[PDB]
Design a protein around this ligand. Structure first.
Ligand SMILES: Nc1nc2c(ncn2[C@@H]2O[C@H](COP(=O)(O)CP(=O)(O)OP(=O)(O)O)[C@@H](O)[C@H]2O)c(=O)[nH]1
Ligand SMILES: Nc1nc2c(ncn2[C@@H]2O[C@H](COP(=O)(O)CP(=O)(O)OP(=O)(O)O)[C@@H](O)[C@H]2O)c(=O)[nH]1
Ligand SMILES: Nc1nc2c(ncn2[C@@H]2O[C@H](COP(=O)(O)CP(=O)(O)OP(=O)(O)O)[C@@H](O)[C@H]2O)c(=O)[nH]1
Ligand SMILES: Nc1nc2c(ncn2[C@@H]2O[C@H](COP(=O)(O)CP(=O)(O)OP(=O)(O)O)[C@@H](O)[C@H]2O)c(=O)[nH]1
Lengths: 299, 299, 299, 299
């Protein structure tokens, strides 16, 4: 199954937006000490954290207090990580986000499940105190989870600097929703060279930083342009030379030709390490025109 | 009897293509760990592999996992390879394709059967991961079997760089359907130089690689042109200088002349080793007239 | 008695053609391990050679397999070989050909019977395997059998590229049918110089090859022209400057004169080795008008 | 008595010709190894040769086999040679002709009977075997027989090469007809000189080659012309200057004059050896008129 959980106030916003837009095959869960935030957020399972220590009045800038509030409701928390694929979303540098995420990642690992972590670095102007905590959380998180995706918040101010705040954070959510709606297709309707969950587990096992996302294109070179757009999202870290895995899930129509598929494979292969491990596969449907989607994963 | 067994996703695709086209005298069997592929494939015997290890997910990029999975259900596959002629079709460089090829080819050999392997090399621009294990599978398969046919996908891009997705793989499948039609044609319709399965098991139990496939012609030199077309199929490998077999099966109408038949034999006789062995045969019927087919097998 | 047996596919074809045309005073036997050929052949006494070792599929390019199969079923085969005149016809190169002709010839020889063998050589452009195998078979047959008749198959190519294989192998059948109808004539309708089987046993026992055959003529020099046509028959390029036998059997009508008969004898007596043993004979009837048949058993 | 026995195919043909023509006072016997010829020969006593050595098929161009076969049935053979005058007809150079003929000759000689043998040399263009066999047979026969007659077949070519074989051989039969008719006309009916069997025994006792024949004439010199025709028959041409016998007896009519008889006597003695006895004679009957026959048994 697919379970996406949000730890901290930042994670609750991502869970809220993801649930508002709606996804298929994924279950939304929110974990946060402050009961005030959980009241306004919308999801299915709202597992309140350690009220016996926090009572629901926030954590503050102390990851130790977040960890102490965590690792107390583990008996209740263990039931939610009993799935196949999990997406832990947490804004680092805060309170419960930097403390509950490590213990939840370890708990999900002990349940033998694939983990993907979505973190967001704080604004540079927030302060050295606010950024050191986020760096500490990020460095220790990659030792537990096998895939970490980092979205620097200040990057939003360099790509989309004129929006009504919420939609500025919508770009950060775009990566997560795209990855979830792409993976839920990779574990769905097959065809030709269709992949399954085993390939996903192989491509996302003990690697580190990862890049995921999808795009669309309806030009003459539909597959190539869609892949190029998906692999180069503006708000992601531009570092793909040191990559040792890949996954391509072209979902074009009958108009797609073998030359275009081979060109897409060449374009993904030429931008990463020569000794890469490409696990591709094409799903084909006789309902759409030249438009071709492209789900891409790197690590 | 004639059995065609597919291994891996490529094997399932080839078996589906053969079943849709319709083959006389052949029985289709598909074996692959991924239960999704077997669910969405078309075949008579759908023998699932060792789900006790990797139920319904797939071997990924791990030939050893497929090797272990096949050995789990080795008893179930022993009762299906107990035939006369077997065609193991599997796309090398993958998962179960590279792992269920060795143990099933050996299993078929222990039943005293004539083995023909149809494999497809992966794309050159697809990473060294897909290429090294494909080479390993080819090297181990030529050891366990006596006839191996290789059709690299790159050649397809140099033959049909256009048309829909399935047409390229159908062109890859053309040689196998042509060969299975030729083999099932020798058993029926005895001719003047009538051949039988004993002659077939003279050129397929020796040497390594081989080239098979039929063709058609309707000009004045019908037999000669048909033989020249069948001997030089585009996507097949071009190596006829080092050949030590021939199974020419000129099957034309009464309009065929002795000069044309002798010329057709001499055409293949002059393009192979001087010390080669020819086991030719001819079938004559009054229903095709000028049109003459030509089934050719090398080694 | 007159018995003609055929070993191999070529032997079966010759037996079928001879039965189709019809022969009086002769019996037809077919021996070939390939039960597929026997199922569609036309004859009277069919013996399936090698019922155990071959199983009825075929022999392939293995004369040793044919030899073993012949040795397997000697008991049921010796019964039919007990006669006076036997015609063993075969196509060299095959498993049931060169590997099964010497054994049956030896069985006939150790039965006190006159043995005549007719072999068909393979096409020159069929590799060194067929040529060497045919040479070995001919060498091992001429030692045992007393009179062989060799018609290379390329003679049909370089003489009559007229019709299909079904109507050009009939041109190679002319030798055997002409010999049989013309040997069965000696045992009927005694003439003025009446001959019988005791003379045949003398003329067809020297050694080596023979050019037996018959022809007809209707011109003023009926006997001479018919004899010249019969002795220099096509497909027989073997030089006849050396010979030690003759069975001229002029069977003309009352119009024949002493001068014409003497010229018919002399034309043969001048075209062969100077010292020779002519066993000529003449049959005269008031029904053929001017036509004169020219049966000759020159060896 | 007069018995004519034929050995060999030529002997059987001559016996059939003589029986068809009809001769009074003579008995026809045919002896031949092959029963096929005897089944069609028109004769009274058909005594088969040595079936025990060889069945009734043929001799096989071998004098030894025929001679050995004759010795097998000597007991039955002797039953017929117990007569006064015997005519052994045999075609030399063949099988039983060079076989039973010497043994029947010696049997007749032992039985104290007058022996005359008629042989026919084979055609010159029939190889060295036939001529050598004929020479050996003639040399052997002249030893054990008191008189032989040789009429080579090649001589008929220079006399009447425009007649059918069945009728032109009757031209060679005229010698035996004249011999068997002149002898009968001596023993039967009286004459003025009245020669009997004593003179015949005198003129045919251990001499060798001889010329025997009769002729008719009706000119003014009937007796002179009739004698000259019978003394110079076109078939047998030998130097008569060395002859040592004569049986010139005539059968003229009343018109015959003493001068004509003296001239008929003198003409023979003019062209032969001046020595040796001329046992002449005359028969007179009042029916012939000017027509006068002439029989000569010159030796
Ligand atoms: N990209 C985004 N970052 C966010 C968002 N909301 C908060 N954040 C970031 O996350 C960080 C704050 O983390 P939290 O809200 O989990 C802090 P804490 O657990 O102490 O929250 P309370 O207990 O509710 O006070 C900080 O760097 C923010 O800039 C959002 O909607 N998008
Ligand atoms: N010529 C073709 N090659 C194919 C086709 N499908 C797959 N392949 C090739 O075969 C290889 C993939 O092999 P498989 O599908 O057996 C890999 P695996 O066993 O891991 O499949 P899953 O367990 O379903 O993931 C790869 O090189 C493909 O390019 C096809 O239809 N035609
Ligand atoms: N002149 C002819 N040659 C023939 C004919 N059929 C076969 N052949 C020749 O004979 C040879 C083939 O021999 P066979 O048919 O006996 C082969 P084999 O004994 O292996 O029979 P199978 O087991 O049925 O294959 C080859 O040289 C042919 O060219 C025919 O009808 N005519
Ligand atoms: N003048 C004739 N010569 C004849 C005649 N028939 C045969 N011959 C000659 O006699 C010779 C043949 O002798 P035979 O017929 O006795 C030979 P053989 O005893 O072997 O006869 P078969 O046993 O019947 O084969 C040969 O030279 C012939 O030319 C005939 O009708 N007339």
């Amino acid at each position: 199954k697919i379970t996406v959980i949000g730890v901290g106030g930042a994670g609750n916003n991502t869970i809220t937006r993801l649930k508002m837009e709606g996804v298929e095959g994924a279950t939304t869960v929110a974990v946060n000490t402050d009961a005030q935030g959980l009241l306004h957020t919308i999801s299915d399972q709202k597992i309140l954290l350690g009220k016996q220590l926090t009572k629901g009045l926030g954590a503050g800038n102390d990851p130790k207090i977040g960890e102490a509030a965590a690792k107390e409701a583990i008996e209740e928390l263990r039931e939610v990580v009993k799935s196949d694929m999990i997406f832990i979303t947490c804004g680092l540098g805060g309170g419960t986000g930097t403390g509950a995420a490590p213990v939840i990642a370890e708990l999900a690992k002990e349940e033998k499940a694939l983990t993907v972590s979505i973190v967001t670095l704080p604004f540079k102007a927030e302060g050295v105190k606010r950024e050191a905590n986020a760096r500490w959380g990020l460095e220790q998180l990659l030792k537990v989870c096998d895939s970490v995706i980092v979205i620097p918040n200040d990057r939003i101010l360099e790509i989309a600097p004129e929006l009504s705040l919420n939609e500025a954070f919508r770009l950060a959510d775009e990566i997560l929703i795209g990855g979830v709606k792409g993976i839920t297709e990779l574990i769905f309707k097959p065809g030709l060279i269709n992949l399954d969950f085993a390939d996903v587990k192989k491509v996302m096992n003990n690697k580190g930083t990862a890049i995921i996302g999808m795009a669309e294109s309806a030009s003459n070179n539909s597959a190539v342009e869609a892949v190029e757009l998906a692999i180069s999202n503006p708000l992601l870290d531009v570092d793909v030379s040191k990559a040792s895995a890949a996954l391509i899930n072209l979902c074009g129509g009958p108009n797609l030709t073998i030359k275009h598929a081979e060109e897409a494979i060449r374009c993904v292969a030429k931008k990463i390490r020569e000794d890469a491990e490409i696990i591709w596969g094409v799903i084909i449907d006789q309902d759409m025109g030249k438009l071709t989607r492209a789900t891409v994963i790197l690590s």
